[PDB]
Design a protein around this ligand. Structure first.
Ligand SMILES: CCCCCCCCCCCCCCCCCC(=O)SCCNC(=O)CCNC(=O)[C@H](O)C(C)(C)COP(=O)(O)OP(=O)(O)OC[C@H]1O[C@@H](n2cnc3c(N)ncnc32)[C@H](O)[C@@H]1OP(=O)(O)O
Ligand SMILES: CCCCCCCCCCCCCCCCCC(=O)SCCNC(=O)CCNC(=O)[C@H](O)C(C)(C)COP(=O)(O)OP(=O)(O)OC[C@H]1O[C@@H](n2cnc3c(N)ncnc32)[C@H](O)[C@@H]1OP(=O)(O)O
Lengths: 188, 190
């Protein structure tokens, strides 16, 4: 529909120009819709940014949630999380620019709305960690919140570095090396 | 004169933290420092010059102090323990600093970001030094991807701070130093 056409054109425009520099009129023209047609679907530019993130994250979570059911151990569940995270962003370079640079807004009001959407993804990491402790696979007395922040922070930094290096190298191929580091640490 | 230069730097930290980088005009920084707009322009080209120099100055001082301190530590674990505790302590000691590092320095403009990341190299090279020495010591096992390990360490420390800033500093960040250390050292597996 026209809705997804605007969403996709927004991903391209925001990635290319930056969020604040982006023009709603330009997003419309690239989507192939009239200027007024965008406002039938979105309140403003902020609504566009939040909705595209909510949408894509919403798709990513529901795929992830059912996919990790097939995997028994916490290590296997985390392996899939990392490879899927890396795979989605490697498949479309515009997406990585949005996630690593453009969604990193400093305005408290806007950033809280962004981080609210992030919560669903981090919740999956929490579940993997809590059930891992239950089985005795994951360290007992380990802080789930801190481990969640290590896992996400590590994955995120790997992506950011890749983005800053013009995405010239294979991000997906780093999946297993990242997993082992998070599993056994630097001492190993 | 450097004292005036650094006075502007310190005034800018407060302004950028309290106002946000977008609303951090030269005139506001001037008013904070208690100097005329012209005085600022004798030391800096513009708002962007101040932000980069701000980061260069404070990171430089952090690195120098860090290089100094870790000389007293023996193992890579102890060296990393110190890096983590000092990183947390600096940002916990002045919340204005943490706002600048976790939010305000996170610029979307690729050209500005590249200049910021250039200053970040010196910090990451200390982590590289700790790891490469650790491999050549037997403390860290062979075949460790240094780059990825560095990215893991910084990413973990950085995300822990950001979460703390986003939760309005409502917990003891420095007290988490050892827990973060053990997670990086031993991982999540039992
Ligand atoms: C208030 C005042 C401030 C107080 C400050 C004092 C307090 C200090 C503590 C606070 C610190 C917090 C920092 C503040 C915020 C900074 C900005 C952020 O957002 S930070 C958070 C976000 N993070 C960031 O923004 C940091 C993102 N990272 C970077 O931008 C860069 O890694 C770099 C510039 C940091 C280093 O660059 P470089 O020296 O070049 O090293 P590279 O490894 O990148 O590249 C080497 C070559 O190898 C290739 N290669 C690399 N990796 C891999 C791999 N895994 N597999 C295969 N290949 C790989 C690569 O293609 C390249 O190839 P080529 O070019 O030779 O062909
Ligand atoms: C466009 C395409 C999209 C692609 C599709 C997506 C799939 C692939 C992409 C992957 C996603 C990439 C993300 C891209 C978006 C960029 C956004 C970033 O900047 S991300 C990079 C930067 N990262 C960020 O910006 C994320 C920063 N984190 C946060 O802002 C939050 O953790 C949260 C909102 C995520 C969750 O919040 P919440 O659910 O509230 O859970 P909390 O634990 O935080 O709070 C619970 C309570 O516990 C307290 N407490 C916490 N720790 C401790 C402790 N150690 N001791 C004692 N107490 C502690 C705390 O004070 C709080 O107090 P209260 O509530 O009782 O008063």
């Amino acid at each position: 529909p026209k809705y997804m056409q605007i969403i996709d054109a927004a991903v391209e425009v925001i990635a290319e120009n930056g969020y604040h520099q982006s023009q709603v009129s330009k997003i419309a023209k690239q989507a192939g819709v009239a200027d007024g047609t965008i406002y039938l679907y979105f309140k403003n530019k902020e609504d566009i940014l939040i909705s595209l993130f909510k949408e894509k994250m919403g798709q990513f979570i529901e795929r992830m949630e059912e996919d990790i059911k097939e995997k028994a151990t916490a290590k296997e569940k985390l392996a899939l999380v990392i490879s899927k995270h890396f795979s989605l962003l490697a498949g479309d370079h515009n997406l990585a620019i949005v996630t690593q640079l453009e969604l990193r807004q400093s305005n408290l009001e806007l950033r809280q709305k962004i981080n609210e959407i992030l919560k669903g993804y981090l919740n999956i990491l929490d579940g993997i960690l809590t059930e891992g402790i239950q089985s005795g696979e994951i360290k007992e007395g380990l802080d789930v919140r801190l481990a969640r922040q290590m896992i996400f922070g590590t994955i995120d930094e790997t992506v950011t570095t890749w983005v800053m290096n013009d995405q010239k190298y294979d991000l997906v191929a780093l999946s297993n090396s990242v997993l082992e580091l998070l599993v056994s640490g630097i001492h190993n």
